Structures are given as structure tokens and as C-alpha cells.
Design a protein around this nucleic acid. Structure first.
Lengths: 106, 92, 78, 92, 77, 95, 93, 88
DNA sequence: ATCAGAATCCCGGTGCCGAGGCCGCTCAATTGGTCGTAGACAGCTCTAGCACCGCTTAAACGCACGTACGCGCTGTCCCCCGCGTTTTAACCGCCAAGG
DNA sequence: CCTTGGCGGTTAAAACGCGGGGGACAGCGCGTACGTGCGTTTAAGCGGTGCTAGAGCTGTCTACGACCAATTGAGCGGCCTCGGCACCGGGATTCTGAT
């Protein structure tokens, strides 16, 4: 019949077929379910969406139309749960959150 | 004393550019690497990765160090503060 | 070349880290710490490079070294 | 030879959540790094889950449990919703 | 039930940690900390337990949770 | 002829650093664990070894934390640990 | 096998665990020999020190406390096991 | 479990010394832990280099990555020595 | 209370490498047929554990009286900060030593 | 008449040199909660007693997974367009030193 992609069937933007292949050749298990790559692709897509949402918001706050690594850093660090998820991750060219000790201030 | 320091804090916390000079960092990396294996080459992105990682590390270390100094009712970070921070981190 | 990491550069890094005032002995101390850090990462990186039978340290070798040292780095997988 | 990244999918998602917003190449590199990282975390945890329970198959259930272990709170619940909905729709 | 972790017990733990003198406010603080820790481990542990379609938390579930928090425990395998 | 302040504390430090027994009472720990667990998943049971594992882990964690806390207090030229010290230790740990 | 490699640790078992551990599609003949040798070596070092500790405490049997003392008083073993909790090991005085 | 092998080793290094059940449990935990660290690292090494086979070379590199200093040198020596003897 | 001084943020004016879009080919995803071993379902035993209890007591908080720990301020001395002088950290475009 | 050395210099950034400012170390004096010895009422250690609960094992039934041949959608080479915000110079606003 006319081909329909697994991503299209799953209602996703992220590639289910590619994710499946990566699972198969990643030596994770002897067999893989069909639903596994669908689920995984969906989760990855969702997380990507949350981060791009916050980073885009940060980009608009700086009167900017293009997201840069700084915006990703602002997005991640000002979000408690993303900050937890990426607690051991370095964002290149992200810098740091503005934060000075109030006590130190004159 | 302090006003320009505060100014600098605001300035550099606002920006994201690398704070160590590129060429001397490059030299340091190649020197250290030369001590493990000779006639090594480097992708430019490899050195860039090393510098981003190193500066993020040092910056975080300085945050913790600052907290250690402030804890001891000081405003000036000292080697003691760095050593405490790194000890609690499990680096030493 | 560790001395190439100048007083002003270390001062800038500390500023980003929120430091207002800096003892004179800090800089040398910092140079020690950084040195150690680099030695640990680069070592592993070179190990990867040697395992792949290459003479060129790649960005990915560095990324893997950082990852196994729990220093995950984003932005250089490309 | 062919080279691969998540770039176009990240872009599509970006256009979903911010129709008038673009993204630098470096930021895209960071997003690709992110996706690969979370992929390895989830797949790895699911592999361990399957092994612990003497199962040779990684299913959506392993993926779900792995998501619950790795992600905090609301992020986990929302991710679970997206995953479950995607699988239920896909099967139908 | 958090009060079941009594002052003396906390003093004993601190002694093992080499602490010579202890503020009165420590104990409640400690309890909070302990609570958080437990909540983090048990959560993950139970997750494992439910993945195995069981109702009994095993020693291995705990071990896996601790392991995944980077709090590796020897002696209960 | 009562002992000097700071002698029995030290003696206790010696004593408990020289031993390995669990320092928290079993039953209250059990009750606390089961209580916390009820808030995640219901009608749970526990192997005794599971609870024991939780207690070894918890006590090891608390002891290490108290070591770091002590280091913070000593850093501030004190001999007395305060909640402030614990909070510093936990912040630097990334907790 | 283990006799031929001069090892006490089970080469066959290590090989099997490698095959079924989802590590790679294939496993070389020398890999389990090497790995078994490494594991045996590390075990030997730790049991050496822990045994010495037992002698100091005048107990023939080795208990977790002795293992803790052995590991923590050795710099490299201590780094290797920096994130490990030994049940009933206590701490260094 | 590795109990019988741990015991054998123990009898090699301390002929008149025994071991409690708990301590044995800790040794078993140890052996499994290091097994997973080394095998995992070797797996990643094989994947990074698009190799489908884990060989003694991956094991060795993994050991050099995971073990500190003298432990690494000696472990590497023992591994190579064992492979050489096995091969003979 | 006010009054003067360098540093900060946005506006005429604009371009150059960064970002986005057609044509199409060889690589990745889909369809199709054949084993084929794995998952959901259903039944059965009894052991590790759940909930309250008898005997016993170690033990956490409060009483009596006091002292070294914590802290704000005083007296002193003790270490960073800014502009002019340049230089070797570098990087470019011409002389003179053995073939 | 053909090869590859170091001073010479566009850019910009801190060791010396003199005047200036904010903070650490020890004591005065205050304020006080647990050390050490007891006194009381409660839940845990140890061992009993009743009981309701599902994990490992085995058999049914089912079906997508993996592997081996065609078929097709597509991401970037190769170009071909389209554009975002800092450099240049200037206007308007702001903490800090000084009266």
C-alpha cells in the first residue's frame, strides 16, 4: 500500500524508525518491542519541546528571535526540574545565572 | 574598593564569552597532552571543548569557594575556601 | 604554560563565579587545581585516542572523557 | 558517506512551540547533545531493567519505568503521558 | 514517625562523624535531611518493585535505587 | 569531681568511630520507611533485608554528612555544628 | 579455561556473563581471561590488606570492618571505591 | 556468586584466615561492581569505534580508564600475563 | 539635604557571513514471506512477613547551679585599587649565511 | 643565482610607583544552654500467636521479531536567495564621590 511512517502513525515529529534502529544496534537487549521506540521517541520529543519552549521564552525576553546557548542555559537553570535533570551537564557558551550575595552588596 | 568588583561581577555573569585567552590555553593543553603521548594533534573543537569544560568547572568551583568564604564571615576567598569546597565535593 | 593562565583571567572567572574579593595566594592555588583537572581529562581523552589508533585528539574523545568523569558536556557532538 | 543528527526534528518541534523563532547552529548542537544524552540514559536504564527481571525484550514498559526513574516529578508524569498516548495511538 | 529518630541516635551518628559539640537546632534539621534522603531512595526502590509486578520491596530493589543515586551499597546482594 | 566539658563527647567519638553497629533504633526506622513508602505505592510489603539496606545506607549517609558539616563548622572557627553548616555542606554536595 | 590461564576466578563464567550482559554482539577469547585475571588481582589485594587487619585484631575470620579499614587506609583502593558504602564497615577513627 | 573463588584466593594470600558471611557478601558485591564497570566501559569503547567485538584490548583500555595508578599497572600486567599463559 | 562625574542602553545608517529554499541521487525506511522464540494468561504451594501482645527495662525530657562559647565594639595594623611607563604573549613581509 | 633565520612593527593588557580605603586579630563585657547528678513514664528487645498473601514454576495460546529480497521517501551536494545584529557616532539616563 502507500507507505505511512511509524512517526506519522504515532503522531510524532521525532523519527520512530531511527530510534528503533538505534535501540537495535545499541546492544541494550536481544529483542525490542515496536512500542518501545514509539514511547522513547515521544519522550525525547516532549523533553525537546519543554526546553525549546523555555529557551524561546528567554530569547524573546532578550528581544531576540534566534535561540542561542545562553537562552538554553537560562531556560534550564531557571527551571527547577530541568536543572535537576541536567545537574551534571555543562552547556557550552551558556554562562551562568546572574546571582550576587545580597549581604555582600554595599 | 568593591564598587568596580561588583561591576565586574554583573558584567561577567551577564555574558558567556570565554575568559581565558585562547592561545595560552591551547599551549597549556598541548603541553600537558604532550606529557602523555608525543606528536599528538588536536581538532580545534577538541581544545574548545576542553576550554569550555575547564572554565565552567573553575566558575562553579569559585561559586562554592565564595560560599565557603562567606560562611566564615569573610568577603575574601582564600586557598582554605577552595580546599574546603573541593574536599566536600569529593575531589580531595 | 600554566602561567599563561594569568591573574586577570582568573579574576574574571572568579567574577563570573560571583567573587568580590580575592586573596593574593588564590591564583597559584587555582593554577594547581586547573592543572590537575586538565591532567585528568586529557589523560582519559588521550587514552581514547590511543585506543582508536589515532594521532589526533577529537572533540568526541574529550566529550567521552568528560562524560566518564561525570562532567557531561553539551555542544560538541557535531 | 552519510551523516546524521536530530536537527530537523528539533527544528520541527521548535516551529511547533515558537513559530517565529529560530536557533543558532551551536544551540542546535547543544540540543542534539541533549537528545543523545537522554537517549542513552533511558535506553541504558531500560536495558538494566530488562536484565534484572530476566527479560530478553525491552518494551514500552521498560521505557516507562526508566523514564520514571530518570526524570523528576512533573517532568516524569508529563513525559509518561506523551509516551503512553503515542503508543496507544500507534497501535490503533 | 520522624520523631522516632531520637536526639540521642542523631548524637550517636554525629559522634561517628567526629562531631564534638552539637547545636540544639541540629536534630530537627537532621530529620528533614533524613526524610528527604529516604523519600528519594524509597521512591526509586518502589519503582523497581512495581516494574517487577511485585508488592514486596526486596533488598535488590533498594540496592538498585541506591546505585542509581550514586550511593552504591555493598553487602546486600 | 565531675568531668570537664568536652571529655565525654570525645570519648563517645572514639567509642562510636571504633564500632560498626547501627545507631538508630530498628522499629522507628521501620515505621518511618513504611510510612514514607505508603505515599508512593500502597499495600507494600518489605523484606527485612530491604529495610536493613535502607538503614545502612541512611546511617552511612548521615555520618558522612556530619563529617562534612563538622568541617564547615571548624572552617568557621567553631567546634559546634549548626544547621547552617549542614546547609552549606548539602549545597556544595549539590544536594 | 582457568587452569590454563593460571587463575582461580572462573574464565568460562566470566565469558558467559560477557556474552549475556548485552555488551557487544561478539566476545573475544582473551577478553574473559583478561577480565577474570583483573578481578582476581583486585580481590587478592583487598583480601591481603583485610587479612592483615584481621591479624592485628587477633581474629582469624575476616569481617566487613576489616575490609573497610583495608580499603580506606589504602589510597588507590579508596579512590577506586570512593562512592561505595560497605555495610557494617563503620569509619576510620 | 564468586564465593568459592574469593575463598580460594583468600587461601592463597592467607592460608590460615577465614571470612564472615557478611564480608563474603561484600566481596561478591565488589566483584560484580568492578565487572560491570569494566565490561560497561569496554562496551562503550567498542561502540565508539564501531567494533562489534569486545576483546582483551578493550578490557585493557577500560582498566586503564577505570583504575588509578599502580592498581592499573598491576592489573594490566596480570591480565596480559594471564592471556599470554592461556594462549601458550 | 543637593551637585558633578564616567559608565550604561537605544537610535540614524548598513552590510557579510549565517540561515533558509529548489533538483535530484544513493541511503534509509517500508512492504512482503518464513521460521520461531518470546509475552499475556491461568493454576498451585507455603514461606517470609504483617498486626497485636506478655515480660522486662533502658531511656528522653525536666530540675539545680554554674561556665566557656558567640557575639558587637574598641584599638591597631594590614592587604587591594587606579593611571603612565612600556614588552614579549604575538604576528606579520624584508636581510645575509652556507651551497 | 636558489633556499628560510630574527629584528622592525598595527592591535591591547598588566608588573612598578604614590596616594587611598575596607577589613582581620585580641580583649571588654554581655547572655546563656548543657555538663553532671537524678527522677519519672513509655516504647523497644526478645519471644508468642493468629493469618491471609503472591513468586517461582509449568502448560496454553498467540504473534510480532529477526532475517532475507523488492520498492520508495528523502538530506544534503550544488547552487540560489534572504536576512540579523554589531560597528560608527550620538542622545538620554544612572550609582558614587563630594559640598
Amino acid at each position: 500500500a502507500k507507505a505511512k511512517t511509524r512517526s506519522s502513525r504515532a503522531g510524532l515529529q521525532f523519527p520512530v524508525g531511527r530510534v528503533h534502529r538505534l535501540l537495535r544496534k545499541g546492544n541494550y537487549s536481544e529483542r525490542v518491542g515496536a512500542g518501545a521506540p514509539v514511547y522513547l521517541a515521544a519522550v525525547l520529543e516532549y523533553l525537546t519541546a519543554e526546553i525549546l519552549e523555555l529557551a524561546g521564552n528567554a530569547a524573546r525576553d532578550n528581544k531576540k528571535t534566534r535561540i542561542i546557548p545562553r537562552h538554553l542555559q537560562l531556560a534550564i537553570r531557571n527551571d527547577e526540574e530541568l536543572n535537576k535533570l541536567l545537574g551534571r551537564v555543562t552547556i557550552a557558551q551558556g554562562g551562568v545565572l546572574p546571582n550576587i550575595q545580597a549581604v555582600l552588596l554595599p | 574598593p568593591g564598587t568596580v568588583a561588583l561591576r565586574e561581577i554583573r558584567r561577567y555573569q551577564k555574558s558567556t564569552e570565554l575568559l581565558i585567552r585562547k592561545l595560552p590555553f591551547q599551549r597549556l593543553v598541548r603541553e600537558i597532552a604532550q606529557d602523555f603521548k608525543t606528536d599528538l594533534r588536536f581538532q580545534s573543537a577538541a581544545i574548545g571543548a576542553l576550554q569550555e569544560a575547564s572554565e565552567a568547572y573553575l566558575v562553579g568551583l569559585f561559586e562554592d569557594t565564595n560560599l565557603c568564604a562567606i560562611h566564615a564571615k569573610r568577603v575574601t576567598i582564600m586557598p582554605k575556601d577552595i580546599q574546603l569546597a573541593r574536599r566536600i565535593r569529593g575531589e580531595r | 604554560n600554566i602561567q599563561g593562565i594569568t591573574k586577570p583571567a582568573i579574576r574574571r572567572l572568579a567574577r563570573r563565579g560571583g567573587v568580590k574579593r580575592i586573596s593574593g595566594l588564590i591564583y597559584e592555588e587555582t593554577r594547581g587545581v586547573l592543572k590537575v583537572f586538565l591532567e585528568n581529562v586529557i589523560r582519559d581523552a588521550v587514552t581514547y585516542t590511543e585506543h582508536a589508533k589515532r594521532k589526533t585528539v577529537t572533540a568526541m574523545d574529550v566529550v567521552y572523557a568528560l562524560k566518564r568523569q561525570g562532567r557531561t558536556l553539551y555542544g560538541f557532538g557535531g | 558517506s552519510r551523516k546524521e543528527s536530530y536537527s530537523i526534528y528539533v527544528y520541527k518541534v521548535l516551529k511547533q512551540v515558537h513559530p517565529d523563532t529560530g536557533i543558532s547552529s551551536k544551540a542546535m548542537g547543544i540540543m542534539n547533545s541533549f537528545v543523545n544524552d537522554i537517549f542513552e540514559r533511558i535506553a541504558g536504564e531500560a536495558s538494566r531493567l530488562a536484565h534484572y527481571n530476566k527479560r530478553s525484550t525491552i518494551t514500552s514498559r521498560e521505557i516507562q519505568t526508566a523514564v520514571r526513574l530518570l526524570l523528576p516529578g512533573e517532568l516524569a508524569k508529563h513525559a509518561v503521558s506523551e509516551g503512553t498516548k503515542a503508543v496507544t495511538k500507534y497501535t490503533s
